[PDB]
Design a protein around this ligand. Structure first.
Ligand SMILES: Nc1ncnc2c1ncn2[C@@H]1O[C@H](COP(=O)(O)OP(=O)(O)OP(=O)(O)O)[C@@H](O)[C@H]1O
Ligand SMILES: Nc1ncnc2c1ncn2[C@@H]1O[C@H](COP(=O)(O)OP(=O)(O)OP(=O)(O)O)[C@@H](O)[C@H]1O
Ligand SMILES: CC(C)CCC[C@@H](C)[C@H]1CC[C@H]2[C@@H]3CC=C4C[C@@H](O)CC[C@]4(C)[C@H]3CC[C@]12C
Ligand SMILES: CC(C)CCC[C@@H](C)[C@H]1CC[C@H]2[C@@H]3CC=C4C[C@@H](O)CC[C@]4(C)[C@H]3CC[C@]12C
Ligand SMILES: CC(C)CCC[C@@H](C)[C@H]1CC[C@H]2[C@@H]3CC=C4C[C@@H](O)CC[C@]4(C)[C@H]3CC[C@]12C
Ligand SMILES: CC(C)CCC[C@@H](C)[C@H]1CC[C@H]2[C@@H]3CC=C4C[C@@H](O)CC[C@]4(C)[C@H]3CC[C@]12C
Ligand SMILES: CC(C)CCC[C@@H](C)[C@H]1CC[C@H]2[C@@H]3CC=C4C[C@@H](O)CC[C@]4(C)[C@H]3CC[C@]12C
Ligand SMILES: [Mg+2]
Length: 1469
């Protein structure tokens, strides 16, 4: 039928099959002008309906709109005038074919729809959609063909049709211009994000993120300038969506579980599929489309080889094939990037929807299930389980995209070689089994590695925190070896694990060559008729390279799904747990009473004995009643039942109004004191001040360093029981509720503060004089000022009555009211916390193992190592003692590192390793040239002319070259492993000796947290991931370099393209790293908050639920999640930006190569066009891998830099010098000071000045003074802890300066101010140096009155001790340090005021012991008990750093003076 419509033939061989070939103006003016129209017509109504339903306000008109409308109008008028001219040309006696009638009319019809659809878009967000943007591309691609034919026809010399050509040419141009104009964003400039408003091209090449790329390059970027996340992902939206389906599923699962077996089994997985099936479908379609291109390239490569093999062909074939290869690569990359983006976005959505839902359940779960779990366990649950589920949802489509890819690949190989292909596959299948046996061994080793690493850190924390005591007694040398033993014991396991990992990389590295040698040898040797040729060989190599990945990622995917199974099972127990029952507390306005108990009976457990039994009482409003009883009576249980935290058994409770809670164990949040007192309330001034003053929290607040705005909590000043109780009471009284349930709020405070609080806050005349008060107490001091008292016994009420009535009853109250009341004095003080902010990770900026397939082994290990390391830190309980707020306040008053690391490794081995890797690359190029020659050999011979000698020679050499390649790699890997284990040893050892020898200034300025982190995190980083990246980068670089030598060697001209693309590569490279690095940090800083908040709320749930303050905390958690969800996307998109740019560069560098071998084909063979393209086909992704891998080693080298800084910290005076003292130097206790002047730090002034005193032998001296007089400095001046800015100290005629450092301390003894006990055994604390024998030790405890405890202990001197002697009680901790100093029996003893916490009897013993034992010695004591200072031969007085009075105490008191005035103030005599 088409023959009469048109006039020419549709298709004839003569049209083609010629040097010059072209489709006729019949095929081009038919199907090529029907496809574009069909797309627009068929698909128009769907887009019209999609706009119709969602029509909103019109947007302001912009210049682009009018340009796009006027160009279409020009097209319309052009088509109209063409139709008019055609109709006017021939009317009479001219059967003009309808191709000149329909085609003109068709276009005129379409342009109208284009005008309409464009206007409709003006009413939507994205103006330039995908519909028109794809239509224009289709039209241009279809119309390019008419162009060539038309031009040629005219150029050839025919002038018959010139209007049509000119008309068509004008339209084709205007189409180009319209397509160009249809790419501009034309933004409304919405500050949220430009993702919603972006044309098709911008949203497909990611050329809208680049703004941030320009912003972060100039100046560092903060959280302000990162675009917000879209509404579809906001936490509030995701939760509701997931909650609907969760609620709908669980109930059905519960019903199914109840119907049978008469705890759900599988509901979470379904709830997720039913919620997010649509994204799954879209991603599946995109992955299916991409999977096709993976096998398209090899066919074009075979066509190129065939075309270049012969000579009598046409150029058009080669040019068309090159263009097709370019287009296929571009399309495949564009589809793959979009699929990656969709999948990763879905993963993030799932992770947020699980984390927020877990948080929301945590604060509504029953008490039984909550008490079953642990505080840290639930935090680890959210921090680990949710992350595991994110990974298994980032790489699930692989499962189906493998069993298909593999199958397809196998099919092709068979259609290319024959039954021989099976031989290669089998060798490529046997590898996986072997890989497993080695992974299990690696895990087995790593477990013990982790165990030994844990203990070392436990000794490190103690020594770093208590560095003062070590210096005083000179115990530094022992701990050196004590920790080096553990270091070596760990190093051997590290070396074993390292050499095992090398075997695995070797098998995954040589498998390509092995499969090639086996397949080719079997194919050529199995039958004499078989003859190799270039196309078959090179295509087989390409398909092997394609297939090598899935068979090596499928094992990993199966292992991951196995972990996600148990992770899912654990979460479903928590998210599916029961809820607490509330059908026992009736919140009605009884009014008649604010409380009523109708024979209630509640139990803590499910069905155990009732803790509270048969309770019935009622108290009117405005009544203060006190609940008293013995220990374990059940008061707090009664108040918890009032709150409703127990399970009802029998009865009901009526409550009118709100409630307030003051728990026995005070709970404090993180933040300022003002934030804690407010607890989410509008700030006032007439009530805030009243609350603070009434709770007597004013004097203390004045003494805090920051006043009211002082950070309190885990990461700040740790207050004592006395204060934390007053803060809790102040918060409760400021919130101003109706019913107050106080549980012992006056226990930690003393008598004065307690009386003041009772008379000013809660009592007959106080702040809460109208509200009802229920207080539980243990002291009978405030009983007469109450209204009604109740005595609880065995959980039930024994007697209820007024104070006078109970006293008149004459029974239990008489005995009860004796001296039960217990008073508490000031309790300890504050405790500052050393900053330990460390959260650097290893697995970052990497989302799946599909983006960087070459390095899947290392990526998997890093994830597992990070997950394992998370638990340890959570379950660690670091015990670095603590510091007193008082003492802390006084204290306040470039490529070179790469060279350093290489020098630590050893340049001698580095040279040989580089030589080995380079030699391997040469053997690679050599093998390819042997095959290229072997394949070339075929053309000379034929089927029945191949000799046997050639057949054997062409394969023996191939085998030899493969063997050489394998050997050189193995050697390179074998040495690399050792070259590192040595580095970790020298770096740590060198660092430890230097850091352990630093002066006190450095230890005082830098917080302990920073110093200990270097010994733990960095050492782990510099001995684990570092080597993997350092060994992968060189392999990638050498592969790229080898590929380029091959292409340039074949055709020299290519050298030109190398320079330009490099300038682009190194440019595109700096940009990415200059931004990604900053986003990596932001992510870590904005994560820890979330887990901190969850831990806080879980610990303080009853207080949260007593005040009815749950919505605020839910909102806080939602904001904290939306801050991190905004930052993750900002790097998930950046990685996709780089890919489109580098995959484009990599595809361009192969397109040119192909064309350069079609213009110079004359001097080229088929095989030479094989080794050049077969390799260059896999250079696109290798660039992306190199940039990503070089963006990780650059981020990881930061470890070595830190370690180096502390290895070069200033040191103090040498331990031992040549100047030795006379034997038994401290013969007599003769000390003298000559104008001794000193300063703590060079920037600080002299603290002690003009000191001139004399110390006699066998003399007892008492140093006493005022605050800030430098009393304690005197001691820290005799142990040469500081220097000597002025003057000197002479003992036994020998200046302390001349004598060596470790030569002086040994012969001096000092009792520590705060007795500290190290871990280990009792022998280690008493004598780490094992110099003494047990016999003389056994005498020491006899003198110390401690032999009774130690003899009857579990062991003798071998008994272990926990942290800071936690197993031992306080009484012996101070006592033991007395015995420690007793063993040394030195000559000069410097005592200090350290008997403050020693009990009277013990104190007395300590005091007399000093006198009985130390008699033939000199004793200098700095003390505050002026009374105790009475027997000193000479009393020295310091004012502000100057000696004042030096005389006997009797003389000092006989003659009035500053000492006598102090004694008069003290009143000792
Ligand atoms: N959280 C709990 N879980 C289980 N049983 C508990 C719990 N708290 C208390 N009990 C049980 O109830 C008994 C009474 O505890 P409760 O704290 O009510 O007594 P109390 O007299 O108020 O104590 P105290 O005088 O020390 O404040 C305990 O000895 C124990 O047997
Ligand atoms: N670590 C330090 N860093 C800086 N200056 C310090 C440090 N320790 C002490 N000082 C300075 O030295 C002064 C004297 O401190 P020292 O403890 O010797 O005085 P003191 O009169 O014995 O104290 P107290 O009355 O509390 O027993 C401090 O007030 C302070 O100015
Ligand atoms: C598949 C397309 C899109 C790209 C691949 C190149 C195409 C255009 C080339 C590759 C091989 C070519 C064929 C090779 C040999 C012959 C036999 C001849 O007597 C008629 C033409 C015909 C059948 C050619 C037609 C064009 C052809 C199919
Ligand atoms: C708009 C662009 C993408 C169209 C691409 C095809 C163009 C560039 C091609 C198609 C047909 C080609 C022409 C075909 C034949 C000849 C005759 C020859 O003796 C000189 C080159 C010349 C004149 C070619 C020039 C380039 C040409 C016009
Ligand atoms: C399909 C899209 C993407 C690109 C289309 C490119 C087409 C139009 C190009 C690519 C290679 C070109 C051919 C290359 C060489 C010659 C030989 C010359 O003596 C006549 C023109 C002729 C025969 C060209 C015709 C046009 C041609 C076939
Ligand atoms: C993007 C696509 C559509 C256009 C670019 C295709 C390029 C590679 C094509 C288009 C026109 C082609 C040229 C057209 C005409 C001739 C003359 C002929 O005697 C030798 C080949 C030569 C010199 C062609 C080489 C290849 C060529 C330059
Ligand atoms: C097996 C191992 C020990 C071989 C050692 C390879 C050495 C020579 C290689 C591996 C990693 C390389 C570094 C990788 C990254 C960069 C960042 C770039 O901006 C400058 C070069 C620099 C700094 C490289 C210098 C050379 C380097 C240190
Ligand atoms: Mg209690």
């Amino acid at each position: 039928m088409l023959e009469k419509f048109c006039n020419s033939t549709f298709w004839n061989s003569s049209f083609l099959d010629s040097p010059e070939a072209d489709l006729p103006l019949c095929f081009e003016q038919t199907v090529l002008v029907w496809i574009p129209l069909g797309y627009l017509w068929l698909l128009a109504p769907w887009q019209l309906l999609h706009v119709y339903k969602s029509r909103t306000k019109r947007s302001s008109t912009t210049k682009l709109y009018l340009a796009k409308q006027v160009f279409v109008g020009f097209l319309l008028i052009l088509a109209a005038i063409e139709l008019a001219l055609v109709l006017t040309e021939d009317s009479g006696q001219a059967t003009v074919p309808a191709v000149r009638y329909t085609n003109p009319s068709l276009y005129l019809g379409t342009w109208l729809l284009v005008l309409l659809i464009q206007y409709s878009r003006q009413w939507c967000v994205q103006k330039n959609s995908w519909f028109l943007s794809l239509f224009w591309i289709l039209s241009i691609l279809c119309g390019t063909f008419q162009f060539q034919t038309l031009i040629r026809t005219l150029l050839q010399g025919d002038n018959s049709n010139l209007a049509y050509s000119c008309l068509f040419f004008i339209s084709y141009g205007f189409q180009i211009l319209i397509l160009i104009f249809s790419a501009f964003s034309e933004n409304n400039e919405s500050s949220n994000n430009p993702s919603s408003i972006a044309s098709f091209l911008s949203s497909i090449t990611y050329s809208w993120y680049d703004s941030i790329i320009l912003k972060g390059y100039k100046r560092p970027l903060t959280l302000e300038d990162v675009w917000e996340v879209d509404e579809e992902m906001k936490t509030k939206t995701l939760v509701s969506k997931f909650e609907t389906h969760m609620k709908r599923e669980l109930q059905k699962a519960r019903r199914a579980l109840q119907r049978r077996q008469e705890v759900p089994k599988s509901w979470l997985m379904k709830a997720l599929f039913k919620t997010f099936y649509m994204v799954l479908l879209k991603s599946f379609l995109l992955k299916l489309v991409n999977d096709i291109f993976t096998f398209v390239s090899p066919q074009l490569l075979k066509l190129l080889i065939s075309f270049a093999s012969d000579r009598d062909t046409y150029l058009w074939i080669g040019y068309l094939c090159a263009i097709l290869l370019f287009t296929a690569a571009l399309i495949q990359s564009f589809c793959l990037q979009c699929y990656f983006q969709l999948c990763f976005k879905l993963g993030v959505k799932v992770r947020t929807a699980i984390m927020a839902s877990v948080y929301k359940k945590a604060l509504t779960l029953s008490n039984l299930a909550r008490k079953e779990y642990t505080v840290g366990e639930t935090v680890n649950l959210m921090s680990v389980d949710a992350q595991k589920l994110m990974d298994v949802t980032n790489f699930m489509h692989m499962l189906w995209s493998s069993v298909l890819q593999i199958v397809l690949s196998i099919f092709f190989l068979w259609r290319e070689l024959g039954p021989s292909v099976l031989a290669g596959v089998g060798v490529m299948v046997l590898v996986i089994p072997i890989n497993a046996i080695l992974s299990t061994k690696s895990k087995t080793i790593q477990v013990k590695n982790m165990k030994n690493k844990d203990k070392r850190l436990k000794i490190m924390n103690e020594i770093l925190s208590g560095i003062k005591i070590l210096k005083y007694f000179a115990w530094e040398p022992s701990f050196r070896d004590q920790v080096q033993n553990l270091r070596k014991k760990e190093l051997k396991n590290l070396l074993a694990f390292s050499q095992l990992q090398c075997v695995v990389i070797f098998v995954f590295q040589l498998t390509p060559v092995l499969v090639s040698v086996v397949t080719f040898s079997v194919y050529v040797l199995v039958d004499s008729n078989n003859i190799l040729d270039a196309q078959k060989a090179f295509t087989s190599i390409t398909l092997f390279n394609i297939l090598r990945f899935p068979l090596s990622m499928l094992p990993m995917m199966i292992s991951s799904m196995l972990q996600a199974s148990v992770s899912t099972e654990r979460l479903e127990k928590y998210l599916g747990g029961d809820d607490l029952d509330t059908s026992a507390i009736r919140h009605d306005c009884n009014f008649d009473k604010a409380m009523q108990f109708s024979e209630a009976s509640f139990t803590w457990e499910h069905d155990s004995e009732a803790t509270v039994r048969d309770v019935n009482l009622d108290i009117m409003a405005g009544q203060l009643v006190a609940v008293i009883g013995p220990v374990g009576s059940g008061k707090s249980s009664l108040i918890s039942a009032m709150l409703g935290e127990m399970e009802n058994v029998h009865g009901h409770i009526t409550i009118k109004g709100t409630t307030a809670y003051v728990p026995q164990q005070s709970w404090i949040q993180n933040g300022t004191i003002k934030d804690n007192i407010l607890f989410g309330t509008e700030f006032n001034e007439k009530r805030y001040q009243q609350v603070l003053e009434a709770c007597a929290l004013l004097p203390d607040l004045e003494m805090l360093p920051g006043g009211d705005l002082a950070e309190i909590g885990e990461k700040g000043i740790n207050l004592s029981g006395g204060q934390k109780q007053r803060i809790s009471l102040a918060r409760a009284t400021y919130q101003n509720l109706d019913i107050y349930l106080l549980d012992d709020p006056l226990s930690a405070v003393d008598a004065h503060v307690g009386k003041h609080i009772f008379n000013k806050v809660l009592g007959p005349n106080g702040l809460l004089k109208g509200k009802t008060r229920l207080l539980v107490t243990h002291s009978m001091h405030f009983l007469p000022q109450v209204d009604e008292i109740v005595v609880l016994g065995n959980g039930t009420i024994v007697e209820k009555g007024s104070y006078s009535a109970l006293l008149a009853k004459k029974g239990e109250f008489a005995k009860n009211l004796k001296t039960f009341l217990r008073h508490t004095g000031p309790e300890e003080e504050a405790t500052v916390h050393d900053g330990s902010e460390e959260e650097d990770d290893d697995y970052g900026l990497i989302s799946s193992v599909e983006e960087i397939p070459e390095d899947a082994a290392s990526i998997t290990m890093r994830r597992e190592n990070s997950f394992r390391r998370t638990l340890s830190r959570s379950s660690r309980s670091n015990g670095r003692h603590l510091k007193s707020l008082r003492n802390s306040l006084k204290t306040r008053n470039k490529f070179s590192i790469y060279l350093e690391y290489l020098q630590a490794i050893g340049l001698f081995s580095i040279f040989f390793i580089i030589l080995a890797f380079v030699m391997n690359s040469v053997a690679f190029i050599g093998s390819n040239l042997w095959l290229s020659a072997w394949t070339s050999d075929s053309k000379i011979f034929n089927s029945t002319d191949y000799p046997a000698s050639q057949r054997d020679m062409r394969v023996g050499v191939y085998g030899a070259l493969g063997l050489a390649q394998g050997i050189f790699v193995f050697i390179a890997h074998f040495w690399s492993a050792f070259g590192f284990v040595h580095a970790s040893n020298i770096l740590h050892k060198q660092l430890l000796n230097n850091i352990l020898r630093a002066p006190m200034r450095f230890f005082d300025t830098t917080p302990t947290g920073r110093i200990v982190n270097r010994f733990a995190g960095d050492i782990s980083t510099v001995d684990d991931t570092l080597p993997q990246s350092l060994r992968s980068w060189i392999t990638c670089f050498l592969g790229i370099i080898s590929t380029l030598v091959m292409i340039c060697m074949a055709t020299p001209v290519f050298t030109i393209i190398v320079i330009p693309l490099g300038i682009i590569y190194v440019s595109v490279q700096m940009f990415y790293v200059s931004t990604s690095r900053q986003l990596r940090r932001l992510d870590s800083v904005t994560r820890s908050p979330i887990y901190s908040h969850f831990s806080e709320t879980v610990s303080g749930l009853p207080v949260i639920r007593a005040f009815e303050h749950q919505q605020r905390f839910l909102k806080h958690n939602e904001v904290r999640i939306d801050t991190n969800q905004k930052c993750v996307f900002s790097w998930i998109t950046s990685n996709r930006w780089l890919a489109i740019r580098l995959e484009l560069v990599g595809n361009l560098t192969v397109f040119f190569s192909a064309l350069m071998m079609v213009i110079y084909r004359d001097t080229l063979s088929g095989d030479t066009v094989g080794f050049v393209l077969s390799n260059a086909l896999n250079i696109t992704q290798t660039l992306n891998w190199l940039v990503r891998m070089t963006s990780e080693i650059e981020t990881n080298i930061v470890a070595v830099e830190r370690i180096t800084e502390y290895t070069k910290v200033e040191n103090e005076a040498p331990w031992v010098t040549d100047k030795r003292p006379p034997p038994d130097w401290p013969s007599k206790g003769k000390i003298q000071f000559n104008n001794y002047q000193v300063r703590y730090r060079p920037e600080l002034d002299l603290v002690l000045r003009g000191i001139t005193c004399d110390i006699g032998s066998m003399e007892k001296i008492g140093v006493v003074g005022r605050t800030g007089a430098g009393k304690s400095s005197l001691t820290n001046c005799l142990f040469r802890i500081l220097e000597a800015a002025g003057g000197q100290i002479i003992i036994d005629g020998v200046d302390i300066a001349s004598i060596g450092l470790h030569d002086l301390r040994e012969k001096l003894t000092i009792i520590p101010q705060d007795p500290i006990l190290f871990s280990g055994s009792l022998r280690m604390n008493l004598d780490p140096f094992n110099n003494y024998s047990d016999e003389e030790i056994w005498k020491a405890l006899e003198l110390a009155h401690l032999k009774s405890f130690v003899a009857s202990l579990q062991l003798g001197l071998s008994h272990e001790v926990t942290e800071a002697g936690g197993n031992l009680s306080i009484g012996q901790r101070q006592l033991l340090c007395l015995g420690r100093a007793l063993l040394r029996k030195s000559k000069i003893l410097v005592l200090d005021q350290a008997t403050a916490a020693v009990d009277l009897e013990t104190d007395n013993l300590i005091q007399t012991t000093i006198q009985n034992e130390f008699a033939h010695c000199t004793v200098i004591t700095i003390a505050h008990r002026l009374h105790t200072i009475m027997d000193s031969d000479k009393v020295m007085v310091l004012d502000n750093g100057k000696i004042i009075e030096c005389g006997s105490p009797e003389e000092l008191l006989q003659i009035p003076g500053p000492f006598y005035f102090m004694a008069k103030e003290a009143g000792i005599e």
